[PDB]
Design an enzyme around this catalytic site. Sequence first.
Site, PDB file in Angstrom:
ATOM      1  N   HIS A  85      14.324 -11.267  -7.851  1.00 20.88           N
ATOM      2  CA  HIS A  85      14.918 -10.520  -8.936  1.00 20.88           C
ATOM      3  C   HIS A  85      15.408  -9.136  -8.504  1.00 20.88           C
ATOM      4  O   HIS A  85      16.154  -8.508  -9.230  1.00 20.88           O
ATOM      5  CB  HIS A  85      14.052 -10.499 -10.173  1.00 20.88           C
ATOM      6  CG  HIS A  85      12.992  -9.476 -10.179  1.00 20.88           C
ATOM      7  ND1 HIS A  85      11.652  -9.746  -9.944  1.00 20.88           N
ATOM      8  CD2 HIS A  85      13.064  -8.165 -10.496  1.00 20.88           C
ATOM      9  CE1 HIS A  85      10.949  -8.647 -10.123  1.00 20.88           C
ATOM     10  NE2 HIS A  85      11.818  -7.642 -10.386  1.00 20.88           N
ATOM     11  N   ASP A 112      10.152 -16.433  -7.382  1.00 20.09           N
ATOM     12  CA  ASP A 112      10.619 -15.044  -7.276  1.00 20.09           C
ATOM     13  C   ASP A 112      10.314 -14.457  -5.911  1.00 20.09           C
ATOM     14  O   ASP A 112       9.382 -13.637  -5.733  1.00 20.09           O
ATOM     15  CB  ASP A 112      10.046 -14.200  -8.405  1.00 20.09           C
ATOM     16  CG  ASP A 112      10.733 -12.853  -8.594  1.00 20.09           C
ATOM     17  OD1 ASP A 112      11.801 -12.632  -7.989  1.00 20.09           O
ATOM     18  OD2 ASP A 112      10.159 -11.975  -9.320  1.00 20.09           O
ATOM     19  N   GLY A 120       9.589  -0.706 -10.922  1.00 20.39           N
ATOM     20  CA  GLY A 120       9.751   0.030  -9.677  1.00 20.39           C
ATOM     21  C   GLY A 120       8.836  -0.440  -8.561  1.00 20.39           C
ATOM     22  O   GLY A 120       9.047  -0.118  -7.406  1.00 20.39           O
ATOM     23  N   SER A 153       8.215  -3.805  -8.269  1.00 22.07           N
ATOM     24  CA  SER A 153       8.644  -5.170  -8.009  1.00 22.07           C
ATOM     25  C   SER A 153       9.070  -5.366  -6.589  1.00 22.07           C
ATOM     26  O   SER A 153       9.726  -4.509  -5.977  1.00 22.07           O
ATOM     27  CB  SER A 153       9.830  -5.531  -8.911  1.00 22.07           C
ATOM     28  OG  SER A 153       9.368  -5.855 -10.245  1.00 22.07           O
ATOM     29  N   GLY A 154       8.715  -6.529  -6.056  1.00 24.31           N
ATOM     30  CA  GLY A 154       9.001  -6.856  -4.685  1.00 24.31           C
ATOM     31  C   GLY A 154       7.972  -6.434  -3.707  1.00 24.31           C
ATOM     32  O   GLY A 154       7.993  -6.899  -2.569  1.00 24.31           O
ATOM     33  N   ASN A 174       6.653  10.288   0.954  1.00 26.12           N
ATOM     34  CA  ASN A 174       7.489  10.904  -0.057  1.00 26.12           C
ATOM     35  C   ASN A 174       8.908  10.347   0.073  1.00 26.12           C
ATOM     36  O   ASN A 174       9.602  10.604   1.057  1.00 26.12           O
ATOM     37  CB  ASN A 174       7.457  12.428   0.110  1.00 26.12           C
ATOM     38  CG  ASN A 174       8.116  13.144  -1.021  1.00 26.12           C
ATOM     39  OD1 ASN A 174       9.105  12.665  -1.578  1.00 26.12           O
ATOM     40  ND2 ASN A 174       7.610  14.338  -1.364  1.00 26.12           N
ATOM     41  N   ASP A 232      -2.523  -1.260 -13.373  1.00 29.19           N
ATOM     42  CA  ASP A 232      -1.543  -2.338 -13.183  1.00 29.19           C
ATOM     43  C   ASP A 232      -0.403  -1.898 -12.284  1.00 29.19           C
ATOM     44  O   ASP A 232      -0.235  -0.718 -12.054  1.00 29.19           O
ATOM     45  CB  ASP A 232      -1.009  -2.714 -14.571  1.00 29.19           C
ATOM     46  CG  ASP A 232      -0.444  -4.090 -14.691  1.00 29.19           C
ATOM     47  OD1 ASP A 232       0.002  -4.421 -15.856  1.00 29.19           O
ATOM     48  OD2 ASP A 232      -0.333  -4.879 -13.725  1.00 29.19           O
ATOM     49  N   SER A 233       0.400  -2.852 -11.841  1.00 24.17           N
ATOM     50  CA  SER A 233       1.750  -2.529 -11.306  1.00 24.17           C
ATOM     51  C   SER A 233       2.735  -2.368 -12.445  1.00 24.17           C
ATOM     52  O   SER A 233       2.408  -2.652 -13.593  1.00 24.17           O
ATOM     53  CB  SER A 233       2.154  -3.636 -10.371  1.00 24.17           C
ATOM     54  OG  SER A 233       2.216  -4.893 -10.984  1.00 24.17           O
ATOM     55  N   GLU A 293      10.254   8.075   9.161  1.00 26.53           N
ATOM     56  CA  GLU A 293      11.110   7.143   8.471  1.00 26.53           C
ATOM     57  C   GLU A 293      12.040   6.412   9.405  1.00 26.53           C
ATOM     58  O   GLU A 293      12.527   6.972  10.380  1.00 26.53           O
ATOM     59  CB  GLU A 293      12.038   7.889   7.506  1.00 26.53           C
ATOM     60  CG  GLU A 293      11.377   8.594   6.325  1.00 26.53           C
ATOM     61  CD  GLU A 293      11.062  10.075   6.488  1.00 26.53           C
ATOM     62  OE1 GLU A 293      11.203  10.597   7.625  1.00 26.53           O
ATOM     63  OE2 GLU A 293      10.678  10.656   5.435  1.00 26.53           O
TER      64      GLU A 293
HETATM   65 CA    CA Z   1      10.474  10.349   3.170  1.00 23.88          CA
END
Ligand code: CA
Lengths: 223, 4
Positions: A40, A84, A175, A177-178, A54, A171-172, A62
């Site tokens: 999805h 899914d 944002g 998802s996945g 962050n 809960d989740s 990163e």
């Molecule tokens: Ca960052």
Amino acid sequence: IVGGYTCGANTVPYQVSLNSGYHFCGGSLINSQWVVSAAHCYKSGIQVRLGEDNINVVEGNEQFISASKSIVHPSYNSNTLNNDIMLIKLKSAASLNSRVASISLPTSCASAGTQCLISGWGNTKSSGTSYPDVLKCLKAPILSDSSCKSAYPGQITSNMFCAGYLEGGKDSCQGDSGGPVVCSGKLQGIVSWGSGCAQKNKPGVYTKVCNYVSWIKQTIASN
Amino acid sequence: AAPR
Ligand SMILES: [Ca+2]
């Protein structure tokens, strides 16, 4: 994640952010070239962001890598969310290190009561919205099939499980998802859906990754 | 029910 805690930078080194000019979903790094996420979440223009803490500041560690393939399960049903799951191939291999690392796929399914770690940059409020800068984590158990079906009658397929807390508050959420549900070092779930977030008697619903291990392996091998 |  509602009712969770700040993970700590790079303590979930397999967690990725899928970015299209903003964070839109999570994912899990399963080897240096492939990420597992939710069907999805599919769209054009996906940049995979690894090594993040962050998501709004360049902190070091990163790696931003474009998706070169985004492969939704052929039997994904957008109305029921059955199947899914999606695989994303990275345009170049990620550099693996302590802060960017893969997570193992399951060799067997997890049982009711197994404790898992669920993570993401999704909404932290059960009413209204607040999106975090840093990664959040939640420890949550897998629920019984009977409890899952009682919560969501007619909606739970064999490719889904529930995890979390029937009392509310943990809960989740949108944002997340996945993103990953990891239990004893194995990726057992993908954040998929739920009714509201952190509501009483409405736990999270997760794609059951153990059902897809052969499909993942075969799809990676042919791509 | 909604996707997350
Ligand atoms: Ca960052």
